Amino acid sequence: TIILGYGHQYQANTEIEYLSNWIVWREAVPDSTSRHKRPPLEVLNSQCTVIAGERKTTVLPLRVLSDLTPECTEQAISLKDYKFILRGGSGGLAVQVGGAGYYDIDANLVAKENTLSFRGLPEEFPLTFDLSKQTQSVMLKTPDDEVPVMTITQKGINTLVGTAAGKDRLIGNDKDNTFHTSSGGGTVISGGGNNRYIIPRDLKTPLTLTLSSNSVSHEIFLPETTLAELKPVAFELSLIYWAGNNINVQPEDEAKLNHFAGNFRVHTRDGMTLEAVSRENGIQLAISLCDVQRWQAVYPEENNRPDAILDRLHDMGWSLTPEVRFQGGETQVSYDPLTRQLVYQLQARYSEFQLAGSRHHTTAVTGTPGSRYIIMKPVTTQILPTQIILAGDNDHPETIDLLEASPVLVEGKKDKNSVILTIATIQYSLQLTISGIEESLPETTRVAIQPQDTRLLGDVLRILPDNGNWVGIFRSGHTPTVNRLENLMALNQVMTFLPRVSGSAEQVLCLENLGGVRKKVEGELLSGKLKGAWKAEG
């Protein structure tokens, strides 16, 4: 970082003055009366030069034009001919103009980013700069005249930064340009190449973007704008704000509007990234990505699930790209609106995954070894089918959990090397399709129907007839649910401990005998109460 001043070399013209009162000789200024003598101070040079090294360098000359107060304007006009010669390096050169002088910026073309910032000017300053012009002047509106308070010669600048809150008219180059526009609206006319824009919120004037015919791609960043503030207008690339001034994106020629299909990406603070996709009769802005971390940052109170986000986005009237990726989170979720299929690609090992079908899409899980999928309880009718794809390594078998689903009747089916289940609660039902990657069901996967009733998938695949006939696997009747299977093989005190369960309010302990001799359990209850011994079905 280099802070620059306005230093001139002076020549102090002086004379020798006899002080007869103190019998001494002293240096003195020349006598003004004696005809016309040289001034006491005379300015010789008005130049300054910085040569950048190899790293990134920021140059910040003293800000002389910081407002429109008459004294500051007079000072800036006085300093309007000062010469700045700044030569950038490979790292990159960022120049924040002070407000007055002759700037000679020589930025290296190798560098990835050369910035020219006008933020030092007064906040509400009419700006007009063109990156395609080698030499340009910035005029200042003084009373009854225009003074070229600035004169900038630039080479290699591609990161124009506007003023704070002024009506700016920025024009880009044929190369890649980045526009940090002001908050006062105006007009931006990019050139060719890939142009990026960073537009703040609360524009004081509609901002018009012109898309040059040689432009190829555009990324628009709205770091202070969320998606809830954008009205979903179809067949228009303009970003319309619900409250406040709106961006007014228009191409140079309306005929080639379809050219910006997939090359006009609009980011957003909350996470969504609108993408321009060509529709049947034009273009439309549809949601393409959703960085769930940013969404949680903006809306932590709301439930964060890809399905919830999807239905909320549909509620606001937003189209969806054929492939919607939900980056972030423990899994990379993808969506296919045409087929209404949601795909989860698990990444970690031994990961607890919760599975819940919805009424708008079919849920699919691509598992990883050791993982545990829990089937969430059905809550609505007409739940679309679900699919689990097991990854069987025969050493870390996955487990499929129905404990939280509270099943009442479970029926199985077999077809094309894939077990199809159904899970019906007391009122609803849900269809689940277990499959495998290698066209074979891993015979070590454990299905947990009831807390003490866990059945291997190899065991289950036996009793299933090969024809597609549904055979009863489990029913809530028969013997009740067992919360502890304590064998009578254990001898003497066993301090059987069954913790309280508030929701169920029913604990069943099963005393099992496998020996050929009648047993006699001499029990002693220390806490809790028993309802008796279960005898029959009903």
Partner: protein, 113 residues
């Protein structure tokens, strides 16, 4: 969430974070605390010295004690033979107020959930 192989060495200083209390259990066979739950790497500690840990008001049938925040631990014999099974066995030992150690992994995941 994530465990780097061999990041912890025997003799390393360990301590609990500035949480209210870290609950410890004297029984795990049927209190159902050592059964797997959640995703990632399960670490099973065994604190040898438990003098000075205040007991908690326990309902009949459960043994739970609370550990004072910022208590010293001397890591001893970290065994990751079951790393492929995402199970990491670690043995600890209490010490004095030594004022050092980490309650988080190098990647930053908090220990003693």
């Amino acid at each position: 969430s994530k465990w780097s192989r061999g990041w912890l060495k025997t003799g390393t200083i360990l301590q609990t974070p500035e949480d209210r209390n870290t609950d410890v259990y004297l029984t795990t066979i049927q209190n159902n605390v050592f059964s797997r739950q959640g995703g990632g790497y399960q670490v099973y500690y065994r604190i040898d010295g438990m003098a000075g840990a205040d007991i908690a008001d326990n309902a009949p049938g459960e043994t739970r004690c609370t550990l004072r925040p910022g208590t010293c631990f001397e890591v001893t014999s970290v065994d990751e033979r079951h790393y492929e099974w995402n199970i990491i066995y670690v043995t600890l030992k209490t010490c004095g107020w030594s004022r050092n150690g980490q309650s988080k992994t190098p990647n930053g995941d908090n220990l003693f959930n």
